Amino acid sequence: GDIQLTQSPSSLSASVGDRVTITCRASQSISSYLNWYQQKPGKAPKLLIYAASSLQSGVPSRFSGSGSGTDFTLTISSLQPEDFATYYCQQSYSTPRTFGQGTKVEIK
Amino acid sequence: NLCPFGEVFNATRFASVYAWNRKRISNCVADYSVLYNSASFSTFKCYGVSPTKLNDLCFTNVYADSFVIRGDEVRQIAPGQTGKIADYNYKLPDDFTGCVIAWNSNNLDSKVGGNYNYLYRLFRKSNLKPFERDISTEIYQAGSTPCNGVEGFNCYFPLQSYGFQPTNGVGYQPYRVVVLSFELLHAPATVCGP
Amino acid sequence: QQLVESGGGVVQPGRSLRLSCAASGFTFSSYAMHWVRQAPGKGLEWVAVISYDGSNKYYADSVKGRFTISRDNSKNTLYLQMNSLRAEDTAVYYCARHATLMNNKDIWGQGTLVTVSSAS
8 A cells, every 4th residue: 555654743833942853754664765845835845854864955954854764853953933834754765655744833 | 180188188068977078089199298297187197108108109099088076086096996986987997008187176166055067876786897888877776676767765866966065175176087098900090199 | 957837727627738847957857757736735745757767657546647747858848738637636736856865856846726627
């Protein structure tokens, strides 16, 4: 069958300077093949982490990924006023690819 | 004639090592003097017979092929060594004649905001045959699970970029390695110095 | 560097609408490319791949409507024809790319609305 994703929590209304851990859990053991995206609603999904443990150009280490197997972690640190948007995890293990349902970090 | 060393060595755009440019040169004359009089070149070595001797000792048909690699991996470029550029990207033969000409182009290639034009091949299911490029960008399947053209698990993408900025250290600076390779045949010495 | 899309619009159900998406800056040719879907308020749902470096086409069986995908590689463009429509597919589509642990090439189009309805 398909590979189920489990993104938890699906929203978290947050405040300035937080350290939010947006978890993406997996139904199977996926090596590291999971990503993260920035989407303000109406934008293009700006990639944040590739292979679940590596940063990206333009995106400083206020975001920080880790995890493997089933358990994957979005380590947002020192939460910035521009970082409040709708985010996503991502498998690339098998075909079909599925994405998480999204986690909207938003101002409390 | 004249051989286009002002068009090869002062050229404006070298490709990467996954698709390196090759220029068969013959029927002209060699300007081997200013090669040594250049003296802005980091790693400049030769083979076959001595570099002072090669001014007149001349060639049937030369192959001038050039590319851009990293400042650390250039020691991989040597006839009969290992490492990624000589393993899967560009292969000097077992018996080689030509010169490896290598210098830095940090003021051109590495750009602020990031240089990611350049590429290379990181994997292939065998070591590379000598002087044969590999432009086939299909997915290699390391594990047995067939990905079949699209990416997936046990399989990776073939190519990868370099990361060039002038924020790099001196070991990570881009070299515009041009390689000159020579031969001798029943054909006459069509390219020959003074 | 940049992706452009064919025009979205209101189409009656059961019909077909070819989707064009042209690249710029670097070619389509050496890479794969994807399509994804975003319904308003809904998550990003992957649709279908293209794989030019051999030739193979994979579709989501969640929305298995024979939405056909092929190329115009020499224009760095990609064509997926909207076949066997149904109204819940009314959404915005994106041209996509996945960093598969090797690259960082995830480039996304601007987004155009496909609408599946009998009421224009």
